[PDB]
């Protein structure tokens, strides 16, 4: 199996397929151990955001790829943005203050 970019679930903007392509490979805890040990900060960086579940990020970075610019331009993955609202949906309040 191999996947560049395909569909995503409504609930969590994560790659999935089987209707035309194949849902991309799964990372996980065992692998994020390894990356942290090496010191692959940007690889783990992308592998947690733009490469996976960053709505604007993946589109922004894909355009940068076809333009041959690379870089990244990341953002809060919805797999954490959802948590803010689900926690905020409860009587508890979490706010991400600046400095």
């Amino acid at each position: 199996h191999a996947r560049s970019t395909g569909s995503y679930s409504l609930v969590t903007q994560q790659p999935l397929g089987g209707k035309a392509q194949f849902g991309g490979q799964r990372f996980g805890e065992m692998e994020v151990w390894a990356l942290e040990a090496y010191g692959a900060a940007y690889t783990l960086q992308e592998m947690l955001t733009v490469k996976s579940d960053d709505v604007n990020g993946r589109t922004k970075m894909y355009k940068n790829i076809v333009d041959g610019n690379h870089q990244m331009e990341p953002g809060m993955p919805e797999s954490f943005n959802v948590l803010l609202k689900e926690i905020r949906s409860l009587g508890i309040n979490i706010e991400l203050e600046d400095e």
Partner: protein, 1160 residues
């Protein structure tokens, strides 16, 4: 003059209670109807859980009705229906609220282990707080007569008390009552009076509850939250998209359970509001209020009390909390079955054409439109979709120096993901270098690996300079090489040595390379003879460089040609003069330590190519006649069955103890099993005769099977012994041993009986394999959970103290030395010399300089070395104190990640640990880390004194020992059970043995010393690795022991409050800043405390980190009560938020941003 009011960069996140007005701030409207979607138009209702006016528009830019359509009105709301026409993702972020009539209690702050709302108020949970808010027993709210302030009254008691006084102590019941209770509570005045009363003439009979609540009460008031927010009056609503009802296939919608919940809470709430306007029968309204309570509690967190069912599913409903309580798929990915690729290099891998085509799709597109070919972007897609020849060449361009990193399923350590340079291969399978095939623990049984494409620019450089296989020559666990040649190649180089006498031999001498012409051109053999040739050696010394040394040595044909592969330096010839076994790797290691990376890397490709080729040339096979049985087999078996026969006859005529004759006859067969095993080995080993010149001589068998065993290549004694010898004593499901060992062997036939016996061994073998394989990872998770936050920082501090390293000696009564445990170790300070001078202060023991520690003779067997156990560092680890041991040869690069690499190496060999005064196995490793007291703990002398009995069994009691000397006594308690070891009157030292049994690490650390307890843990945990025979460096054990001793307990008087057990992090940093601040008397002396992996990991600064592993419902709750904030340095919590890792490639980023957050 900043004060920006946008979504910029954040340095921390805060967690606290939300005021009803706090909830109102998020409110983009009020849900008022349980209605979801229309039954006919399938359109969002007015003010339902899915409003368009409240939350967001369905379609992207067109409003609900349709008055406005295109981008003309993206900022203005509709006229007929207040629908802000922006995006549809707005529907994914908008909040919204419901405003209840009577107050409702938050399920979390109510019933979550400690009742927060209760303990804050000092009141029973499921006892009093339940009967008081479920409308059962009314509570008081402060009275100036007869009644106290928080007593519980019945209806009868209520009216009686009301009739006596009344109209001046009014005290309601239910939810709003607890509100007035929490509201009326003065945290300030109570924090004073609680401090006054709970300090007046009370020993340790009160201090418990005293210290606890006063710390808690002080926390909450300072947190900023008002206890009013505990029970909410305004409950906020989750954004619609995060709980949608999307039409599947041909009708049949699919919704989340929250819609069921939110719909119930609204219905119950409105009926409540409607009843608070109609006739209000106390029983009817109160019940509806309890039902709103049920509804809200179920929506927030089911848990817990029955579980609200409905939804037709016999299964419960997924509430909010259950959706955040307890994997990460990714784009640009793929996987396939792996296959060996001998023709590859060490930094290369076979990546399939069609696979790589779809993987670099975004790169191929860009390069196509870049060059020409494709007029536009969509032209490229149609161009690669129609794989048009030219496209493949462009593909050959984009994957040029674009590293792709590989990954296997069970990733135990760092070498699970390694980078390679993509090589196009016409096939649908992924090929891999046969050297790094061992690091992955991968076989070609059908195992399949995954591939990832480093998109980011530096993500490519991270892959090339770190995760690239060529940088991972050595194992992170033990300094030895990891890509060392395995089975096929090693038998290859073993066949390239192995001096055979004569047989097309003779000593016809030449000069290296010319011999190659000799081998191909036949005439001469290859394993002869020996024979002499000219060896041009190269060595260096002092001023390095190279010093030639031509000579005439007696090698073989194999050793001559094989010499060509060897690099410039090295001792030469002598490395080839031996053979191919374990030194095959030894040769590789030494080359790395004396040459460097590149010479070693190319050397590996060469030694790999050599082995395969010559091994293929050799053609060692395994016919049925290769595994020869000894002739004395039937002889030895009869003799053993003769001996056991005599024993059974003795048991028949009494004589010998029949109760344990089972044990002694087992020894007979066990001796018998060894006799056949030795006989088979001595025969199959040497044998042969040859015929040298005048014939008659002996070497060692060229029996293929033997060659494989005498050269690694999966061939051990036990397996061989089963091949031709015999399968010895077999286990019985009971755990006992059968008294009739499998006399036969695999070379011979096997009876149906003895196979049905051996079937048990295999079953319990595979099964036990299945348990310890998952139990291994179960350990690694705990190791990492506690250790994955510390990284080598502040460069290299001062300090000289550190454990005195000495050779692990069981030689006290068994003789077993190991003295390589100091290398790449930084010296403590000039560790003497039988005379003077020698070793420096911070000089790290080189690989060549530890070999210099043999020139100082066997006299010097003790050296103080800086370790992670010590090191007066603060929140990190000194580089010097660590070492160097990596795949890299130097000291660890500043800002590495010691923790994870440490844990990985420790929990990696867990796969090869057998679970069970010797427990032994993986479980033994666990207990040492958990720091658990033994089932029969020994006892130690806290203070050195004179031993005497303290009232023979006068309690209670049970014996009593009292070592008193100099000043003050001690009364230890002996429970009669178990003897003693020191008579009365005798004197003891500070921590002497008076139980001669298992030692408790807690006592050792507490009394003996930190160096002692760490030395105990390391030398005891290693002892279970010796038996399993798995090499693993002591550093990493020390690393986990480091933060295994993270916190301590202060005992005196300081700015820190006594009984509190706090970590030496804040402790040391605060005691250093008090000696020279105002006075050292405003600070106390602390005391190191041993806590296990779990107990240590349980404590951590980030509340986000904790919510990862431990019970989220608890951690998020308690961290909410006090206005806590993560800010924001941990690894784990900085991963889920999805930003740069505060270490490695990052680190620099965090340091800059860490210092940046000093202005305010």
């Amino acid at each position: 003059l900043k004060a920006q009011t946008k979504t910029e960069e954040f340095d921390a996140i805060k967690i606290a209670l939300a005021s009803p007005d706090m909830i109102r701030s998020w409110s983009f409207g009020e849900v008022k109807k349980p209605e979801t979607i229309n039954y006919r138009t399938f359109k969002p209702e007015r003010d339902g859980l899915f409003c368009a006016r409240i939350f967001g528009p369905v379609k992207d830019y067109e409003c609900l009705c349709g008055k406005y359509k295109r981008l003309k009105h993206r900022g203005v709301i509709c006229e007929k229906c207040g629908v802000e026409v922006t995006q549809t993702k707005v529907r994914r972020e908008r909040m919204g609220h419901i405003e209840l009539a009577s107050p409702t209690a938050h399920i979390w702050f109510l019933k979550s282990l400690p009742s927060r709302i209760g303990l804050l108020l000092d009141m029973p949970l499921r006892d009093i707080e339940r009967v008081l808010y479920f409308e059962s027993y009314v509570v008081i709210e402060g009275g100036m007569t007869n009644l106290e302030r928080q007593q519980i009254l019945t209806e009868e008691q209520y009216l009686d008390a009301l009739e006596e006084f009344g109209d001046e102590f009014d005290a309601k019941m239910g939810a709003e009552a607890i509100q007035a209770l929490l509201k009326s509570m003065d945290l300030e005045q109570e924090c004073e009076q609680l401090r006054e009363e709970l300090n007046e003439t009370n020993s340790e009979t009160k201090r418990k509850k005293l210290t606890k609540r006063i710390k808690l009460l002080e926390a909450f008031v300072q947190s900023g939250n008002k206890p009013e927010w505990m029970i909410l009056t305004v409950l906020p609503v989750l954004p619609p998209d995060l709980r949608p009802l999307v039409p599947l296939d041909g009708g049949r919608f699919a919704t989340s359970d929250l819609n069921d919940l939110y719909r119930r809470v609204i219905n119950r709430n409105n009926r409540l509001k409607r009843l608070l306007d109609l006739a209000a029968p106390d029983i009817i309204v109160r019940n509806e209020k309890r039902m709103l309570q049920e509804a809200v509690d179920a929506l927030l967190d089911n848990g817990r009390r029955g579980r609200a069912i409905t939804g037709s599913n016999k299964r419960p409903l997924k509430s909010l909390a259950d959706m955040i309580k307890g994997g990460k798929r990714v784009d640009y990915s793929g996987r396939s079955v792996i296959t060996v690729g001998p023709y590859l290099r060490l930094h290369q891998c076979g990546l399939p054409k069609k696979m790589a085509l779809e993987l670099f799709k975004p790169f191929i597109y860009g390069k196509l439109e870049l060059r020409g070919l494709a007029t536009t972007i969509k032209a490229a897609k149609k161009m690669v979709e129609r794989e048009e020849a030219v496209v493949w060449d462009i593909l050959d361009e984009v994957i040029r120096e674009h590293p792709v990193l590989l990954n296997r399923a069970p990733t135990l350590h760092r070498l699970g993901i390694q980078a390679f340079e993509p090589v196009l291969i016409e096939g649908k399978a992924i090929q891999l270098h046969p050297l790094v095939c061992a690091a992955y623990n991968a076989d070609f049984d059908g195992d399949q690996m995954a591939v990832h494409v480093p998109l980011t620019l530096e993500a490519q450089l991270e892959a090339r300079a770190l995760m690239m296989s060529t940088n991972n020559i050595l194992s992170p666990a033990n300094g030895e090489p990891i890509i060392v040649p395995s089975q096929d190649v090693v038998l290859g180089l073993y066949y390239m040595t192995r001096d055979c006498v004569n047989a097309k031999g003779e000593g016809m001498v030449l000069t290296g390379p010319k011999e190659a012409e000799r081998l191909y051109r036949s005439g001469l053999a290859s394993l002869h003879a020996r024979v002499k040739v000219r060896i041009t050696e190269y060595e260096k010394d002092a001023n390095g460089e190279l010093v030639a040394k031509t000579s005439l040595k007696d090698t073989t044909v194999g050793r001559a040609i094989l010499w060509m592969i060897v690099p410039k330096g090295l001792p030469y010839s002598i490395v080839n003069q031996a053979l191919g076994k374990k030194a095959i790797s030894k040769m590789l290691n030494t080359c790395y330590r004396i040459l460097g990376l590149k010479p070693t890397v190319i050397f590996a490709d060469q030694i790999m190519y050599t082995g395969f080729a010559y091994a293929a040339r050799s053609g060692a096979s395994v016919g049925i006649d290769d595994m020869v049985i000894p002739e004395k087999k039937h002889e030895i078996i009869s003799e053993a069955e003769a001996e056991v026969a005599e024993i059974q006859e003795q048991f028949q005529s009494g004589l010998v103890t029949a109760g344990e004759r089972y044990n002694k006859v087992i020894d007979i067969w066990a001796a018998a099993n060894d006799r056949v095993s030795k006989a088979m080995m001595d025969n199959l080993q040497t044998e042969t005769v040859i015929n040298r010149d005048g014939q008659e001589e002996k070497q060692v068998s060229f029996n293929s099977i033997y060659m494989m065993a005498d050269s690694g290549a999966r061939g051990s004694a036990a397996q061989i012994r089963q091949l031709a010898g015999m399968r010895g004593l077999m286990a019985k499901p009971d755990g006992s041993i059968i008294e009739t060992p499998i006399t036969a062997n695999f070379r011979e036939g096997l009876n149906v009986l003895q196979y049905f016996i051996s079937t048990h061994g295999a079953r319990k073998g595979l099964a036990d394999t299945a348990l310890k394989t998952a139990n291994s990872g179960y350990l690694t998770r705990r190791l990492v959970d506690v250790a994955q936050d510390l990284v080598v920082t502040e460069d290299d501090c001062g300090t000289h103290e550190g454990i005195m390293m000495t050779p692990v000696i069981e030689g006290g009564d068994v003789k077993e030395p190991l003295r390589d445990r100091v290398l790449g170790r930084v010296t403590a300070e000039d560790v003497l010399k039988p005379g003077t001078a020698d070793i420096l202060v911070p000089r790290n023991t080189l690989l060549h300089e530890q070999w210099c520690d043999l020139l100082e003779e066997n006299s010097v067997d003790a050296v103080k070395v800086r370790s992670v156990v010590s090191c007066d560092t603060d929140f990190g680890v000194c580089a010097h104190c660590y070492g160097r041991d990596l795949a890299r040869g130097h000291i660890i690069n500043k800002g590495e990640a010691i923790g994870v690499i440490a844990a990985q190496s420790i929990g990696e060999p867990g796969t090869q640990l057998t679970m069970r005064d010797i427990t032994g196995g993986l479980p033994r490793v666990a207990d040492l880390f958990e720091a658990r007291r033994p089932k029969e703990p020994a006892i130690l002398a806290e203070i050195s004194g004179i031993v005497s009995f303290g009232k023979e069994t006068k309690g209670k009691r049970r014996l009593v020992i009292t070592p008193v000397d100099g000043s003050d006594p001690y009364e230890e308690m002996i429970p009669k059970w178990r003897q003693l070891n020191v008579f009365e009157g005798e004197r003891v030292e500070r921590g002497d043995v008076i139980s001669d049994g298992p030692e408790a690490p807690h006592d050792i650390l507490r009394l003996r010393g930190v160096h002692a307890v760490t030395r105990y843990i390391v030398n005891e945990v290693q002892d279970v690795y010796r038996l399993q025979g798995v090499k693993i460096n002591d550093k990493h054990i020390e690393v986990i022991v480091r933060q295994m001793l993270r916190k301590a307990t202060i005992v005196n008087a300081g700015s820190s409050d006594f009984l509190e057990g706090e970590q030496v992090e804040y402790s040391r940093v605060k005691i250093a800043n008090r000696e020279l601040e105002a006075n050292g008397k405003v600070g106390a002396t602390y005391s190191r405390d041993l806590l296990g992996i779990t107990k240590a990991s349980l404590a951590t600064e980030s509340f986000i980190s904790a919510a990862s592993f431990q019970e989220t419902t608890r951690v998020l709750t308690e961290a909410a009560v006090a206005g806590k904030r993560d800010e924001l340095r941990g690894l784990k919590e900085n991963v889920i938020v999805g930003r740069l890792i505060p270490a490695g490639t990052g680190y620099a980023y965090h340091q800059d941003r860490m210092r940046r957050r000093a202005a305010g």
